[PDB]
Every structure is written in C-alpha cells, then in structure tokens.
Design a protein around this ligand. Structure first.
Ligand SMILES: [Zn+2]
Ligand SMILES: [Zn+2]
Lengths: 261, 48, 64
C-alpha cells in the first residue's frame, strides 16, 4: 500500500515498529500495534436473605447443544484416561465429535455411542488402533451398538480408515504381558509371515495376533497360559485353540532367523 | 571505587571466570482444532 | 571442568602438570612436596594445581 509503488508488499518491522517498503523506505501508518460470567459466593453477609441462599447465583444456561458437547468431552476425557491415551488422540476425538454433532445426522443414537465411536476412529487414525473390546471395557455401551455407530460414522462423515494389520497390536500385547524385546520381534515376524503366506483365510487379525503371542510365549523360559492370553486379547480360549491347531504345521518357517529356542 | 573491581585482562584472556550460558527454547506442534495444524517445515515466502 | 592450559595470573604452562601431580599423590608424597617437584615456585601455579577439581572425569562416566 506504499504510495508511488503500486503492488508492493510491506515488510512489517516488529523491532523498529513500522511498516516499511523494499523499494524506497516510506512508511504507511505511523505505528504498528501488538461469552459469560460466573457469580461466586458472597464474602459479606449483607447479600444473604432471611432464608440465606445469598440471592445472587449463576444461571448457567449456555444453550443445550454446548451442554451436550461439554458432557461429551468430559465423557471422552474420563474414558480415554482409563486406558491412558495421549491427549492428541483425545483432541482428535473431540474434533471428530464436533464434526459429527454439527453434521446433524446421528441424533437418534446416544451421545455416548458417538463418543466411543469417535474414540475408536481417532485411535484408528493415529496408527495405534485399539480393539472394539478394549473400548467396550472402558465404556458403558455394548459391542453391537459401538459397531453400528462406527458403521454409521464411516457412512455419514465420509472418511476412509486404514484396514488394521496384526503388527499394530503386538507391542501393546507383549508389553502389557511383560515380555522382552526378542519375544516382541519374534511374535511380530510370526504374525506378519502368517498373514502373508496365507494360512488364515478370513480369520480375524486379533485371533492370529494372540496366536503369535502364544507362539512366542511357548518357546522360551517364560510361559503364558491360554486364560492370560484371552484376558489380554479379549478373544476366547476356543479361538486361541482354533488358531493354534491351524497354525501349528510349518512352525520353523514362521520363526525369525535366530531366537535361542 | 565504591564497591567495584579492577580485573586482569590477560588473566581473563587465559580463562579467568570464562563461562557459557545455555538457553533452551521449547515448541510443540499443537494440532488441536478442526484444521489448525502447524507442521514443521521451512517457510517459503510463496505460501505462509 | 579440566585443568587450565595456563595459569591465570602469570602464564606458566600448567596443563601438562596435572597427571604427574596425581602420580605424585599416588606415590605417597605430600601436596607441597609434589608441587615443589614440578617447579611451581610462585603460589599462583600452586593455587592452580592444588585447588583444581577433575570434573571431566565425572563427565566421562555418562554415555556419549
Ligand atoms: Zn515504496
Ligand atoms: Zn602461575
């Protein structure tokens, strides 16, 4: 906006305090620059009525939709703190919840269902997915409702999510089972080889992941029982035996180069 | 005079009371919000 | 953190005289005789060798 120089950008000098031209040094503009309330408790007793009650208190109207969003965010925070999620996933969950709530398509379902569905979406989109059963453990909602709500969120908000692979769950399962790094690497190699070689058509990745856990567990000094595997994975012991008896042939090929048998 | 010190320039040249002052500046990528992300990249004058 | 190369006051080289001084403490000599075995006549260099801390040996314990 420099005179005598049409179409000239002005360098803003936050130290010298001016707006300055890189052809002639003129200055345009002499200097540079740079909803509610709460009513608390009364201090003096002069505000109290004959029955007390202080006569002056916060009405806290703040619309209905803002109240719904605030309760939903409280539910998201107290849900994600239980499995100890980092706050980036919480903020992404809040972003998805606000987009869904302003999309105005899922009024017919409990806000808590949309909340846990957005938690699942945000856990998926960071490359650290949780299982549906892990979300169901820290939520008051059945697996059917969260599945249907997840199906409606992906249909409505028009986004694509990456398909889960077995290797994402391996670190959480081994670490929560307190297994060392060699067990981690061996189990991940077993899971990825079993996926790629095609022993398991249409099997869920959670079952073969826990099967790889059982592989790496029943080959070293430390050993884990079927019940512990089902406790940490959520898959039933029958499903572990199904995956065991179907993965057991061609065992040395699935193992890595060295494991110290 | 009046609580002041004369110092040896040659001594200071030889390491007398020489010291360093580490300052650390901390910045995080706060991608909270709808589309208010701030990715770490070299800012060219074309965009930004 | 480490022994200075030169004495601050005079300018005599005292960088090379740390290790041998420690050797003279490992050879059960008193500190005064250990200083006198190095030629540190003026008390500035005796201040240098006598009142120095080898904090670099502490810093070397940490992984690089
Ligand atoms: Zn101009
Ligand atoms: Zn000296």
């Amino acid at each position: 906006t420099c005179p005598n120089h049409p179409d000239a950008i002005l360098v803003e000098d936050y130290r010298a305090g001016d707006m300055i031209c890189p052809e002639c040094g003129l200055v345009v503009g002499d200097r540079v620059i740079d909803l509610s309330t709460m009513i608390g408790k009364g201090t003096g007793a002069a505000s109290f009525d004959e029955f007390g009650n202080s006569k002056y208190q916060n009405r806290r109207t703040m619309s209905s939709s803002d109240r719904a969003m605030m309760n939903a965010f409280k539910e998201i925070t107290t849900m994600a703190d239980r499995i100890n999620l980092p706050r980036n996933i919480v903020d992404r969950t809040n972003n998805l919840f606000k987009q869904v709530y302003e999309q105005k398509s899922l009024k017919g379902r409990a806000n808590d269902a949309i909340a846990s569905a957005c938690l699942y979406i945000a856990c998926r989109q960071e490359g650290v997915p949780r299982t549906f059963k892990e979300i169901c453990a820290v939520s008051r909602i059945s697996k059917k409702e969260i599945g249907r709500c997840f199906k409606l969120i992906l249909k409505a908000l028009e986004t694509s999510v990456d398909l889960i692979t077995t290797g994402d769950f391996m670190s959480r399962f081994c670490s929560n089972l307190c297994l060392p790094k060699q067990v981690q690497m061996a189990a991940t190699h077993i899971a990825r080889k079993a996926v790629e070689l095609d022993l398991v058509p249409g099997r869920s990745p959670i079952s073969v992941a826990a099967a790889a856990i059982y592989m790496a567990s029943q080959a070293s000094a430390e050993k884990r029982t079927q019940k512990e595997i089902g406790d940490i994975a959520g898959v039933a012991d029958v499903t572990i035996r199904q995956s065991y008896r179907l993965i057991y042939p061609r065992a040395p090929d699935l193992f890595p180069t060295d494991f110290k048998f | 005079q009046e609580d002041s010190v004369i110092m040896n320039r040659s001594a200071v040249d030889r390491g007398f009371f020489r010291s360093v002052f580490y300052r650390s500046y901390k910045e995080q990528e706060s991608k909270k919000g709808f589309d208010q992300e701030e990715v770490f990249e070299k800012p060219t004058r074309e965009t930004c | 953190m480490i022994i200075p190369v030169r004495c601050f006051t005079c300018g005599k080289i005292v960088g090379n005289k740390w290790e041998a001084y420690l050797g003279l403490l490992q050879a059960e000599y008193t500190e005064g005789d250990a200083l006198d075995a190095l030629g540190l006549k003026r008390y500035c260099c005796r201040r240098m060798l006598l009142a120095h801390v080898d904090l670099i040996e502490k810093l070397l314990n940490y992984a690089p």
